[PDB]
Symmetry: D2
């Protein structure tokens, strides 16, 4: 093809209209200097595969049938790999037909990439749905420079080894010149896996942050291994949260809640990895114990619907919704719930207004690759108000140490911490938020993307 | 003893202070002409059995241990008889130890009654927990005139026959001179049961309302069988609902709900017989179909906690609470649920204010002996506003035919009917409420009690 | 058409080859004197509707699609009517699409019948899947004489009234000149239903067995209502069970079981109405209590697979299979289970050999229209050996009073009774079996069929 | 005290009579040269703590109440630590009261040890119930040399970190001079944990088998870390399996099973870690596919009852027992199951006879510290017959590579492997069994115990 920089991801960066923010916006000044392409599925079943010139980008759509989506995406990706890589919170399903479709779809992505990529081009493959693509691509196109970044956690070897296709996934990733993870921990698991399962020679030292890279020796070539913690466009969110309409909506939100003294907020895709049940349990017990005032404190949980065709998620929804009904029936009043729960997509401007209104942000995943909601909250609070309660089991906890960190399995401490955040002095709240903002403003998605691409370019 | 009129019920009519309204108040002008006694359990485990002179009444407390309560009341009564007599909505548990404790406790009630009752006294035994007492009492005291009234439904023979102790329960009831039920249907089941199981000769004709009594021949004596539909102190509730404080609270309730155009109301003890799940299902589907306006219509469900030590009820609570959380997550807004659910006791004055505020009363039991909430709502609406949606499977439906009657199993028609009630013209609403009030004002608890006692006195 | 006697049933009497025994064989000498037809579904989806001359009979196949089977048969029949008519052991599903398909299929059966039936012909409609056909047929063909026989129980009114389409089903049955049930109890429920729901005038007396018929007045015509308890071809089974090959197989069965002293046997379609779980519970507890000898006593349960596409049945299968595994793990030995359980169809000659081998026949339904397995066992034991343990909640219990009758809900007595049957003296066993055989040999399927047809002919 | 060598374990080595084999027998020639003591709970609630001189040993009983057992053993040990350390197959319960009792009981063991231990004595603490004892003991008695061996797996850090008391457990283990695990993998997890959680300086190299030890620097002292894979008294089992009575019982077992051509055998404590469900699933599917002959092949599963008061285990038992009943109902014949399942303790001589009779040993844990059943089978087959199917997720798989190794999550390969083992040539079977026996005969419990004690003595 005629593109010298190519991104490969499960989805095209569109909604059709181009998706705002995220990866595609981080790369904007690189596309202004390269002939760029994006390979992905357009998000609707059985489409054409004809290239679309989106001015700054050429889009190469990948055709997936409804059956492909069911077995490669909802199946192998969402119901085999996802629960396994997140510490088997739910039991992975090992299904051979799903594996076979995952292989076929990965090959299709690899072929689309080759079609788009010029000779010697740089290719950046994204995330867990496409772990076979680097090896497949190198076999098709040995001229290419290939990076891979995993956006979800990489599990310990004891769990990874469960996968019947463990060796094929590992060989898949080793097809890259650069394999990156958010955290040194994932990088180190990958190195150990390479030694244990593949018998490759690797470096033994700890892996640094955006530095002190590891290496895997594969025949004549070396695979670089690194940690690059993703972030957001901090400055842009900071600006957006100051808009008059956002601030007026935040005020209106508080009015509609009957002007509570304190608002706790949860914002997540409805997923068992997100620890929404832990928040509700802690809040319920604090109310029972009279440690939170049911008359002036309210918890808002915004759950975005997710993976409805996957049975585990329907069961999760049932459990969360029971907790909500239960807590309100026990501690609410007619015309005044203590928990407001919404199960629907939320426009970004509405989410930002909730960040601005929220006195306590509850981000309590059982396991999460990074979690950008934590960083978005921080970027929105230029008033230095608010408080972030953050699970240690997120990538974000490695950078946001000034937050109120919790082990979500330690319910006693989660409860103590919610009380502490709710009752913090203004000065202490400001001190923490000021320190968190310094980190998030300085370590943004631009720093992340440049660091990964510099590392990848270094493999030439 | 020295009492010529004796009431026997599972509980004493106290809360200690005397319980307002109900049976004990209906009998007030009879106690002004008799030496009256009340036999029952004081509602707290392991108490004395020393008589208490409550001026108008002598109270004879029955001692029950916590173990007695568990096996006779929570066990045999609430988990064997209750589900069986209500068309096995839940599977009855047949437990021999529970039966044996039920026999022992019934004997204890019979002995207390004999202690209190003077020679030739009239005795009125209440309800399903004490079905053995009439026979036990007649054996101890053949001089007594004994009436029994069942407040819950009497099931068809095909279901009743499941009971391993079917014959003992039947012989128990046949110890009375008069056996009464709310409805001719229950009376007719009893007659058929007497023929089928006991082989007694009975009358064959239909049983009337407060008339055309049936009879069972038992050796030399005849048992009278009748239908006496219970009611309320209609005039008293009518007066109470007009008080300024009630009306001001009803207005405040509507304000606290954000001034909806329409309020649907459910008021029940949390029980699987009450069809609360049907209301929530119908309401959810109407919202899905856009047939109810989620912006100006709200459903308030007040569930009084019940039988928490009985497993079936904990499961029911879980199911209802899931539905509540689900419906609000799908159709609510932050600061504005479509369903307000409270699981706690409610003071009577607060309940009356909710009756006055409610545009639609939802009384949809799967099976109910009478249901007095339906009649209380009617008595409270002297403004002739509101609408009553009423299950056919209540005793009340036999008298309140002007209500919007529903088969709760016919969900399509339950939904059609809720829409009809919500959108009725003012005139049509008034016509129905006027007719319902004529019935309820004329057929009150005084008429009921006098009719039963006249019938009983007739057996002398 | 050209047939003066027409049978209408859900299935054609074939397997293709003609089905042995049953109804079709009982009618053999009537078909030798009439021009007979049989209307039914050939048991395979989407077939022709072309008549088949089977010599003694003309077969009129009814076309049903797989979707028809799912919604009319597996749906409305097996998952609405079946659980409702059997005392809601499982919760009926009320589904409007199922009802609509049930109506359409019933109309199709009615149209096929009209096509086959000559002028003034006699029509005999069978069982609960076709309850609308008599009214539909009378509207199409007022010249026809129409009988209907219900082979399953007719439930009490309190349960029947749940059905949203209660009135349509009732009007459906009232289209017949004769409505028959196994038992007077079902007939009496039907009479009461007719008065309560339809407001028709009926007879009030008890209904006799094959006599003392009830009546329902419907405008100008009278519907006859009777009880006709079905039976088997007793003499034929008696002969078959004496064959040398049967007796040798029975001996071999005992040898293969390691020559136990006592064999208990259960034979049923796998259905929640059959009380298989009760047998296993009783047997397990008797073993725990040391009241049955685990070294010389064995229980064989032959469950024929049934209704696999209906969820309730998959759950039932799971529960039964757990009990089997549990009891063997607790009381068996390697090479020697105490329970042998087979989930597969069994050839009739093999079933007869099991009847001959079995010391105790366990027929313990929670609710059953008649149950012919009980009568078949009796007819097979011309040696006068064996023992029949029989639930009171079967139609058979009304005729087989000499059996060991049990209330399956009374587990203590079920256990006492199994011990009694296992340890009965030879003489007492013979006395009971002799009396049971006198009843079953004299009251066979020929007597049943002639009694119903005589009653029907009487309506002309 | 007056003992210079002290063993500390949850249970005393008794049954009272001294327990045969195991640890206590491995140490017999050391006790012949030392003044030895054993500290443990005598296995019955609320006992004395008075020392018992068992000739070769002094026994120091630890008093545990029934409540102690419930919260320290059944609670924290069996329902927190056990599932966590075995890759959270079941969700651990994090309970603070359980933790507090675990601390108190561990202190009680530490105090008993100090009472028994002479100055400068060597102490060997066993297994996961007593992980706090080394630190507690060092604080009480800094003069002691302390070893700890973990008999179950040590989980990856990502899972271990869930524990609210992660730091206290880690500090607990670091109180030892020597910490040992079966496998280098566990040792390496421990080293990484020490760096990540405690911030201690550790060695970075791979850990060897009984060599190349790791180290953790704790202030002035160094903790040695090693891998010592446990084994059995191979020679003793080899002799015992040759006894005439054992061989005659093995023959009788095959006769009682109706002389099958092939017997598969499972022997385990009933635990969710043991993968019994996987064996049954594979066997069921092989029968469905006609790849195993249901007429000449039989599977015997001997499950020893375990942890009945722990809810997870009652659920597991239910699931296994359903599978057993299901497979026999589908593929068995009357008098001939394909699966024989026994849930009861089995005498050791009977177990050995089953090892000798079994053509295929199925040892398929999802996760297991070592699993000695695999090695016992090998030691019993001096005839070189049989075949061992072994999960990779056992410690045993690191030494028994000549077995048929399986990933139990790869059901297709488990099935292929069972077929391969069942149909192996005599010569190939012998080749594998010969190689397995060479390993197991040379690497016995004596080698294991001496290696650990040599390492520990080296820390002086
Ligand atoms: O559901 P799919 O389409 O498979 O996507 C998974 C998940 O991907 C992103 O989350 C992950 O990446 C971000 C950014 O690196 C991390 O912050 C998260 O911790 C990862 O889980 C999306 O943000 C998610 O919406 C999406 O579900
Ligand atoms: O829970 P227990 O103490 O056993 O009491 C049952 C029930 O008794 C009353 O309800 C019944 O009687 C009334 C009056 O006749 C009828 O309207 C109901 O339909 C019957 O169920 C009480 O009102 C209930 O609170 C109580 O639960
Ligand atoms: O499953 P379907 O096809 O709907 O048939 C139901 C049932 O019909 C028969 O049983 C019923 O009739 C007999 C004879 O009158 C009675 O003895 C039973 O008690 C009734 O249930 C068949 O025998 C059954 O196999 C069939 O399932
Ligand atoms: O149930 P508890 O009393 O807590 O004991 C657990 C377990 O201990 C032993 O098994 C473990 O150690 C052996 C020997 O090292 C290993 O082979 C196993 O893999 C470990 O699980 C006993 O053998 C078990 O009976 C016991 O349950």
């Amino acid at each position: 093809g005629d593109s010298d920089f190519v991104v490969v991801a499960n989805r095209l960066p569109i909604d059709w209209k181009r998706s705002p923010g995220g990866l595609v916006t981080a790369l904007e000044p690189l596309l202004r200097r390269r002939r760029g392409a994006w390979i992905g599925w357009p998000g609707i079943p059985d489409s054409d595969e004809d290239p679309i010139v989106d001015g700054d980008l050429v889009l190469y759509p990948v055709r997936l049938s409804a059956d492909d989506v069911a077995q490669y995406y909802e199946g192998f990706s969402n119901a085999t790999l996802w629960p396994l890589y997140h510490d088997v919170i739910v039991k992975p399903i090992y299904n051979r037909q799903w594996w076979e479709r995952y292989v076929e779809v990965n090959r299709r992505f690899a072929e689309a990439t080759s079609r788009a990529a010029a000779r010697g081009a740089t290719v950046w493959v994204q995330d867990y749905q496409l772990q076979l693509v680097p090896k497949m691509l190198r076999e098709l196109r040995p001229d290419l420079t290939i990076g891979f970044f995993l956006h979800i956690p990489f599990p310990p070897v004891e769990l990874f080894m469960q996968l019947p296709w463990r060796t094929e996934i590992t060989d898949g990733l080793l097809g890259a010149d650069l394999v990156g993870f958010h955290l040194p921990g994932g990088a180190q698991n990958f190195l150990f896996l390479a030694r244990r399962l593949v018998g490759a020679n690797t470096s033994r030292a700890s892996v640094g942050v955006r530095s002190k890279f590891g290496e895997v020796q594969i025949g004549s070539r070396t695979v670089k291994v690194g940690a690059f913690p993703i972030s957001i466009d901090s400055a842009d969110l900071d600006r957006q949260a100051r808009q008059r309409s956002i601030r007026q909506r935040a005020r209106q939100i508080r009015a509609e809640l009957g002007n509570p003294r304190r608002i706790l907020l949860g914002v997540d895709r409805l997923d068992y990895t997100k620890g929404i049940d832990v928040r509700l349990q802690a809040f319920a017990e604090l109310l029972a114990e009279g440690r939170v005032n049911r008359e002036d404190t309210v918890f808002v949980q915004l759950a975005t619907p997710s993976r409805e065709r996957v049975e585990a998620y329907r069961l999760l929804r049932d459990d969360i919704e029971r907790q909500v009904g239960h807590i309100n029936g026990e501690y609410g009043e007619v015309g005044h719930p203590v928990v407001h729960y919404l199960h629907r997509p939320v426009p970004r401007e509405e989410l930002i207004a909730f960040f601005v209104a929220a006195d306590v942000m509850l981000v309590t995943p059982l396991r999460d690759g990074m979690n950008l909601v934590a960083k978005e909250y921080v970027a929105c609070r230029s008033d230095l108000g608010g408080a972030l309660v953050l699970s240690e089991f997120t990538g974000a906890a490695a950078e946001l140490g000034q937050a109120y960190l919790v082990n979500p399995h330690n319910l006693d401490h989660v409860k103590d911490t919610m009380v502490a955040a709710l009752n913090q002095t203004p000065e202490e709240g400001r001190r923490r938020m000021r320190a968190l903002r310094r980190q998030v403003l300085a370590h943004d998605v631009d720093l992340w993307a440049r660091s990964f691409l510099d590392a990848l370019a270094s493999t030439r």
